[PDB]
Design a protein around this ligand. Structure first.
Ligand SMILES: CCOC(=O)CCC(=O)N1CCc2c1ccc(Cl)c2C(F)(F)F
Ligand SMILES: *[C@@H]1O[C@H](CO)[C@@H](O)[C@H](O)[C@H]1NC(C)=O
Length: 351
């Protein structure tokens, strides 16, 4: 299991000012480090953050965190559950900043909550260097849902941080699971109070959110919300990033106001969503995108079960590792389903 360490720099906090932290399981012989960002939506004003504090407090505070957590999926230490990186050093970073890992603002006389996601990542990396990360060969920053978007927003900053700290030999890579969203038209209506473009636009100002520098320079002031959308931020990144995304992601459908006898309009909407997602992945060389209606994969215990074109995700990730040492015979890394309806892939999760 992974053991809790609260940050020694107690100025790097969860939303309510309690210290942020990480869960760690070291692997003495290993020079591989997996840092996983938890997900769980976000909040973007006083009223909706107050409601989140009432009923989702673990995502806003470390006060009730347990001393340990069990690693599952890519965080499992058993080769049977995790064929990919079972022997790596494992870190689970709880999501307690409600800011898609983008914030750099403290709780103060003017701020009821602290939004410190981007600083939590930097501080975890800094404190791990003294616990063995200084000897790393590869640091894989992974994450699911809001944590997957967090990978896209932070992977290059982790790389820059390690370079400036004097560790240019650590290879920083990203694994973004279920964080690749489309700013598409909703199937029906709008209400918010959501259209994620508007909520993210407000969140960035509420959180003092930060985005990767090259993306920020493209979109400029007032338009940094664009960098929260994978297909727009990905081309600006320098670190290798493997993208995992269900073609019919449940969170995407939720923000699109789709709630599942499907008639023609909704059928065409769903098929076009899968086609648009597939189009955005065409030039992403390392990707795994099954035609399923689901959400998240990499920390699920049965993550080894789904396959695209006969290749599982742990295999694709291993092939990615080999590619980062010309395509490899029978070891693909670009795996995007082409069939057009959820569960047209027989290996999709059953629910
Ligand atoms: C968790 C989760 O499912 N999240 C948080 C980030 C996100 C989600 C859902 C839809 C969208 Cl559209 C976004 C955003 F684009 F803001 F990154
Ligand atoms: C603690 O974190 C804050 C915010 O990231 C930073 O400004 C400060 O230098 C840090 N101090 C130490 C001792 O790590």
């Amino acid at each position: 299991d992974l053991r809790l360490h609260l940050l020694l720099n107690t100025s790097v906090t969860c939303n309510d000012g309690s210290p942020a932290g990480y869960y760690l399981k070291e692997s003495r012989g290993s020079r591989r480090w997996l840092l996983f960002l938890e997900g769980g939506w976000y909040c973007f004003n006083r009223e909706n953050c107050d409601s989140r504090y009432d009923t989702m407090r673990r995502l806003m505070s470390s006060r009730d965190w347990p001393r340990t957590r069990t690693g599952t999926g890519i965080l499992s230490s058993q080769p049977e559950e995790n064929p990919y990186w079972w022997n790596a050093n494992m870190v689970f970073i709880p999501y307690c900043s409600s800011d898609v890992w983008s914030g750099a603002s403290s709780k103060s006389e003017k701020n009821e909550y602290a939004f410190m996601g981007a600083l939590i990542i930097q501080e975890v990396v800094r404190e791990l260097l003294g616990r063995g990360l200084s000897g790393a060969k590869v640091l894989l920053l992974a994450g699911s849902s809001a944590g997957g978007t967090g990978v896209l927003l932070n992977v290059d900053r982790v790389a820059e941080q390690l370079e400036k700290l004097g560790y240019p030999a650590i290879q920083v890579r990203g694994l973004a699971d279920s964080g690749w969203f489309l700013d598409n038209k909703q199937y029906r209506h709008t209400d918010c109070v959501c259209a994620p473009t508007e909520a993210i636009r407000r969140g960035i100002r509420y959180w003092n959110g930060v985005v990767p520098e090259r993306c920020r320079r493209q979109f400029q002031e007032g338009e940094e919300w664009n960098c929260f959308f994978g297909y727009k931020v990905y081309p600006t990144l320098r670190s290798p990033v493997f993208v995992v995304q269900w073609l019919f992601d449940e969170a995407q459908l939720t923000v699109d106001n789709v709630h599942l006898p499907v008639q023609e309009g909704l059928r065409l909407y769903i098929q076009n969503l899968g086609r648009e997602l597939r189009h955005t992945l065409k030039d992403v060389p390392a990707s795994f995108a099954p035609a399923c209606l689901s959400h998240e994969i990499i920390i699920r215990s049965h993550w080894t079960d789904v396959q695209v074109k006969g290749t599982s995700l742990p295999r694709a990730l291993h092939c990615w590792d080999r590619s980062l040492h010309t395509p490899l015979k029978g070891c693909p890394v670009h795996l995007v389903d082409s069939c057009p309806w959820p569960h047209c892939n027989p290996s999709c999760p059953t629910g």
